[PDB]
Amino acid sequence: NGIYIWKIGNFGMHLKCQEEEKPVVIHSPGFYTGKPGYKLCMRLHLQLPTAQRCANYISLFVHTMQGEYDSHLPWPFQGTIRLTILDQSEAPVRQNHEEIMDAKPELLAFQRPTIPRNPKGFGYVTFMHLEALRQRTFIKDDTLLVRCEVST
């Protein structure tokens, strides 16, 4: 059962880029659901203030990647993916920001990739608005934590 926590430091600088209307598109390191297992990564966007309807949102997508075990694994990928922006306050006062989605084997995002990262990602264009970050302690020590849990 694959779990990866993506640590995005220097977050204030990424927010400043977004405020200055400079694109911010970043990718997590690749991580495996198991060994053997699938290789995946996360893609995060800070949508620009001038974007069409999703301005000032965090977008969060998952991508399949070419992994060492791909020849031994069934395709298309099927399973459940939980994406969470972690609330970094203490346990009694904490509420993470979370979505859970089922992979859709019919989509090209979940077929076996032919290049290092599958260009089709699957996720949330409007995962979390930037202003929602200010309501709880999501940023701590200039770091956002993005957790991805994958079932089968």
Binding site: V25, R43, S59, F61, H63, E99, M101, L107, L108, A109, R117, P119, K120, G121, F122, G123, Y124, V125
Partner: peptide, 11 residues
């Protein structure tokens, strides 16, 4: 509230 497929090359 619902997930979608997006191409990282903007189409």
């Amino acid at each position: 509230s619902s997930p979608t497929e997006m191409d990282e090359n903007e189409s």
